[PDB]
Amino acid sequence: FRTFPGIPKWRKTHLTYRIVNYTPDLPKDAVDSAVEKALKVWEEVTPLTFSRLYEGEADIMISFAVREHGDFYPFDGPGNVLAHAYAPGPGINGDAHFDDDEQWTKDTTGTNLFLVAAHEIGHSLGLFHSANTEALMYPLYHSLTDLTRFRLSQDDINGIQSLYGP
Numbered sequence: 001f002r003t004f005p006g007i008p009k010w011r012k013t014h015l016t017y018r019i020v021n022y023t024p025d026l027p028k029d030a031v032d033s034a035v036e037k038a039l040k041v042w043e044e045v046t047p048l049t050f051s052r053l054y055e056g057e058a059d060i061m062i063s064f065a066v067r068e069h070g071d072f073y074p075f076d077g078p079g080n081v082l083a084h085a086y087a088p089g090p091g092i093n094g095d096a097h098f099d100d101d102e103q104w105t106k107d108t109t110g111t112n113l114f115l116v117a118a119h120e121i122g123h124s125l126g127l128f129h130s131a132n133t134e135a136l137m138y139p140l141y142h143s144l145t146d147l148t149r150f151r152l153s154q155d156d157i158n159g160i161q162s163l164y165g166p
């Protein structure tokens, strides 16, 4: 698949992200916080260091839409998941649009801009898709591992242990 070694299309252990827009269901700042947390443990695992936009383009920049836009996995509307993204290279390199349609939350679930952010931050680089418990590749927004020490996927091992190449 994607990912590894020495990192994809940016050989620096100092990368960035940017919420292009923000869907104004949770605070803009809370949707940013949903993403920004994702980053936070992605940086614990790989040697990389993510943060909001330094300059220019980024690794993964995230917009907001869904309500029948025509992209990847869009428009299932509030509740479910919904980053309807593209990989590192594909889209606006590392692209993700969060169900703008939602009513961003954490009713244990509903939807949290947070985990699809991980599914996006991750989807871009290349640990993209697997089937394990602790993983960000795990099926949904009942994020077991929780982003504090999010010990991501089994592909996160054979992906993020590449990212940290430098």
Ligand SMILES: CC(C)C[C@H](CC(=O)NO)C(=O)N[C@@H](CC(C)C)C(=O)N[C@@H](Cc1ccccc1)C(N)=O
Pocket (backbone or CB within 6 Å): 073, 079, 080, 081, 082, 109, 110, 115, 116, 119, 129, 130, 136, 137, 138, 139, 140, 141
């Ligand atoms: C952790 C999550 C953010 C990413 C995962 C896993 C993945 O990589 N899919 O490609 C996901 O997209 N799961 C979707 C698959 C698809 C819709 C994109 C899903 O199962 N969504 C749940 C949403 C949900 C939420 C609340 C309750 C129950 C279910 C569903 N529609 O069954």
Ligand SMILES: [Ca+2]
Pocket (backbone or CB within 6 Å): 075, 076, 077, 078, 079, 080, 081, 082, 099, 102, 111
């Ligand atoms: Ca949804």
Ligand SMILES: [Zn+2]
Pocket (backbone or CB within 6 Å): 064, 065, 066, 069, 070, 071, 074, 084, 097
């Ligand atoms: Zn879109």
Ligand SMILES: [Zn+2]
Pocket (backbone or CB within 6 Å): 119, 123, 128, 129
């Ligand atoms: Zn996926």
